[PDB]
Amino acid sequence: TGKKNLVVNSVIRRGKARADGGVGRKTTGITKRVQRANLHKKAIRENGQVKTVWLSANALRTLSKGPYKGIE
Amino acid sequence: GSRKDRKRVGRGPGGTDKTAGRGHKGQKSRSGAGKGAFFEGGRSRLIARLPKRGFNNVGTTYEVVKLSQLQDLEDTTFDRDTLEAYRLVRRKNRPVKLLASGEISRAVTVHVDAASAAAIKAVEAAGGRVVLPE
Amino acid sequence: THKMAKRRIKITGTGKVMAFKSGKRHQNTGKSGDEIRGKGKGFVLAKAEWARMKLMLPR
Amino acid sequence: AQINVIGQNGGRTIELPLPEVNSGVLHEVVTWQLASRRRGTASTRTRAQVSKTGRKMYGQKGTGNARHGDRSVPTFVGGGVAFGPKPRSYDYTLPRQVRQLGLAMAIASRQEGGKLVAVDGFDIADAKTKNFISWAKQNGLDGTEKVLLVTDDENTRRAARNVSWVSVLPVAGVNVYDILRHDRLVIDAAALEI
RNA sequence: CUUGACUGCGAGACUGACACGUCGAGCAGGGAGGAAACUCGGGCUUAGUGAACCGGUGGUACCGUGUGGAAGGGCCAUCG
RNA sequence: GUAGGGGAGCGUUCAGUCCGCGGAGAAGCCAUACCGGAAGGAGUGGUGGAGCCGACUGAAGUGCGGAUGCCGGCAUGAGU
RNA sequence: UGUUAUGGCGUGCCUAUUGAAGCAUGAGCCGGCGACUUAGACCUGACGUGCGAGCUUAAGUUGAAAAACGGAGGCGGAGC
RNA sequence: CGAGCUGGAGAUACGCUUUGACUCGGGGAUGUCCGAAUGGGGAAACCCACCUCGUAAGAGGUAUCCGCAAGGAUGGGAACUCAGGGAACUGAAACAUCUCAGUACCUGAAGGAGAAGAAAGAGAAUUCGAUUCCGUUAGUAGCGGCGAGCGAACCCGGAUCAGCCCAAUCAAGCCGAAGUGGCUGGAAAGCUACACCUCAGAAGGUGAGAGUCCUGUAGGCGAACGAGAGGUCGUUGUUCGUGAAACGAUGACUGAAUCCGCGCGGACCACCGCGCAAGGCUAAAUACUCCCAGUGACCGAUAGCGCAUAGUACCGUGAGGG
Ligand SMILES: [Mg+2]
Ligand SMILES: [Mg+2]
Ligand SMILES: [Mg+2]
Ligand SMILES: [Mg+2]
Ligand SMILES: [Mg+2]
Ligand SMILES: [Mg+2]
Ligand SMILES: [Mg+2]
Ligand SMILES: [Mg+2]
Ligand SMILES: [Mg+2]
């Protein structure tokens, strides 16, 4: 779980044989077709009192260049 | 009196009961009994293997108004788009178009969305006019 | 079923069925000249009876 | 050409349906009506699914002398039923012209015998049910027949309460069955009449 | 001597359950040989073959999503 | 005359209408030498102790010998 | 009508099959349970009714011992 | 309510009741132990403590989670609703994309309903104006090993219709009209001879078949208390399977304007036209049936729920079955 908004919660990932082409190949056709997940980065800073938690890279870039409801 | 009330003489037949019959064990003998898979279409029997593409569009479709209707009977009621509702040309959903079918002399003036060449010719030959919007 | 639409099962005024001629469509040609314009108009109705069952509503 | 109870004459209006009194149409209509009123409610656990049983049983081979999957099948006792009644409807739309033609033809089917129209339902004097018996008796109705009274005037119909003499169908709620089923039709109020 | 190994079409038949297949007078646009009648829309004939689908190439301009375009599609050839 | 198509019908339950029957006895059950082209239906007798034929129309959970089919009861093996 | 003696004739039923009295399947016996339905504004035919160059409504609204209202829409009406 | 009562109970004993019992409604009053269980432990209904109050008997407090405080939550609920997660047989007459289907299953949150909602929209008329729901458009437009198959939306007809804040009558109940004689019979409500009520003939009970014999019915009344942004990458949604793929949506990395400004109109550009995102709330039309009522061309004892009451007997270590 992150700082601001959302984390994890991911979707599937594919792969294609006869991949690429001359843009106007015969066709693309499919193989992979399986479900998958996503994670992100950890960091530690305090707000309102000394704390640690975890920090989204987006939230880290947010907190670094300014205090949006929090400090480092 | 409902007691005396009779049937339609041939509306209803009885249904088909396959219990009994004594020498009814229905359908086939073997082979393709019991299934819900029958399905009279399908893949490679002369449907595929058939060489068509074409191009699908199906655009604007006009309501056909026969001259043969307009001339001959009624009044020459001076149609416009108004009367068409009650004149038994009422369908809508589409614009209205006039074409020549029956050939007869009358004075008539019709307002439709479009019309054919020989229809124009036949409306003018017996005298009249056909209006179109810009 | 949605295949037979743009492809020709096409129905006529007499409730007959238009397929025509397949003789060679695109691949495999380079033989004669009237086979090529031999792309036709023609059909039998023996297999029309169950044909348009696929085209039934949007004939 | 029918005569009212109190006051003027009329019924020279309303040509009665042709051909005269066709019983087929009548049949179609009433049947349609009882099918309309028919209320589908069906208790069947038809499906092997609907009654309750745990589903794996004993064994497919080697037990000897049976071969069953479940205790809930139609060929068992206590299981589901093969093709049992479910809550259907059977209410449809009868073509309107045949409804009209129907009750018209009904009224007409009363032309080969007794029917009655009326004005002045004031002869009841409240209800009292007795003054209805009087009205009937002096109008020729001894209630040895079955009578369908059609009228407005709540007081006038409220006078007639019994399954013996009569039955009441108000404010032109006329029903082809309801008339053809009763012996005499008393049309009373000339509103939907003429 | 030459490009009928043509384009536009097909009266009427052979053959197949179907889809394929076969033969063909004659009409046109235009041709080639002969002086001429005329003959030729591949080879004395019967084998030398692949339905559909998805794409590659040339041509035509029909569709083309508010409209004028363009993308993509469609049609006539053809390629795997 | 087998699968298969066609026609007429018999019976059972519910339903509306009509005619009705029943403690001087209903349905059901039991016996029967009658009727009907068949599915079937009457007559009288014997049980029974509350209800029920017939006609007309309508609707079906509507007709069993088999499915090593389901439940139940009772046989065989055997006084072994 | 019941039973019987003798004569003549006489290869259970079902399924499955080229072919069954079969030494091929099934089944101890009787009772009861027990299998070609139902649904959709689907499609296509036969018959029947109502209107008919026109024919219908759907949701819903209002009455509801009752049915009326509801033209949004659907099908004819022109083919290529 | 006004003579009975002392539960199913068949049963003896003791009694209670017009100083209105019983029964029916309506609030309070007590409520052992367990269980979210919550002083502490625990193989649920048990074993051990502490701090106050004090005359013991006996009452009271002692879980964690939000908070100044008041206060709120932890649990439970048949189906219904939203969400996090997400099958396979099966179909394609084999099988990978597809189909099954976001179905089943698990999980989270909540109410009597939920969800959804107040245009950076639908859409091609310079039309429409929150949402949901039904009919319809329409098996159309479309998606697809262009196979099996999948399948919209706008218009239009209805149900119901609100936009507001903000950031610089129905329940106890009571009242109720009108028949006698003879007859068959064990017994009558049936037959019969005469008669009556009916804003009451709906119904059940009564020795058999019932308007007028009982309860009722039509009609009438009725209470203290009680209710009613953009991009790239990986991807995905909707008819959208990478297709020319727009747009919404995000996991990662990037992260512009702001009023001659900004997103959209299915690659893309101009024109033209609709529209103001990055903040919240928001009845009604809708779904379901644990429960109650009324009905039925629904069953009537192998039917109907499994049960004419039983999750009992019974089977299993158990989930479970029955
Ligand atoms: Mg067989
Ligand atoms: Mg065979
Ligand atoms: Mg020639
Ligand atoms: Mg393919
Ligand atoms: Mg048999
Ligand atoms: Mg022995
Ligand atoms: Mg021995
Ligand atoms: Mg598989
Ligand atoms: Mg398969």
mmCIF file with all atom_site columns, C-alpha atoms (C1' of nucleotides) in Angstrom, chain F residues 28-31 44-48:
data_model
loop_
_atom_site.group_PDB
_atom_site.id
_atom_site.type_symbol
_atom_site.label_atom_id
_atom_site.label_alt_id
_atom_site.label_comp_id
_atom_site.label_asym_id
_atom_site.label_entity_id
_atom_site.label_seq_id
_atom_site.pdbx_PDB_ins_code
_atom_site.Cartn_x
_atom_site.Cartn_y
_atom_site.Cartn_z
_atom_site.occupancy
_atom_site.B_iso_or_equiv
_atom_site.pdbx_formal_charge
_atom_site.auth_seq_id
_atom_site.auth_comp_id
_atom_site.auth_asym_id
_atom_site.auth_atom_id
_atom_site.pdbx_PDB_model_num
ATOM 1 C "C1'" . G F 1 28 ? -63.696 -46.629 -4.539  1.00 0.00 ? 28 G F "C1'" 1
ATOM 2 C "C1'" . C F 1 29 ? -63.409 -51.881 -4.062  1.00 0.00 ? 29 C F "C1'" 1
ATOM 3 C "C1'" . C F 1 30 ? -65.454 -57.487 -5.548  1.00 0.00 ? 30 C F "C1'" 1
ATOM 4 C "C1'" . A F 1 31 ? -68.257 -61.146 -8.946  1.00 0.00 ? 31 A F "C1'" 1
ATOM 5 C "C1'" . U F 1 44 ? -77.987 -56.350 -11.702 1.00 0.00 ? 44 U F "C1'" 1
ATOM 6 C "C1'" . G F 1 45 ? -75.727 -58.412 -7.480  1.00 0.00 ? 45 G F "C1'" 1
ATOM 7 C "C1'" . G F 1 46 ? -71.816 -58.023 -2.937  1.00 0.00 ? 46 G F "C1'" 1
ATOM 8 C "C1'" . U F 1 47 ? -68.758 -54.594 0.026   1.00 0.00 ? 47 U F "C1'" 1
ATOM 9 C "C1'" . G F 1 48 ? -68.318 -49.618 1.616   1.00 0.00 ? 48 G F "C1'" 1
#
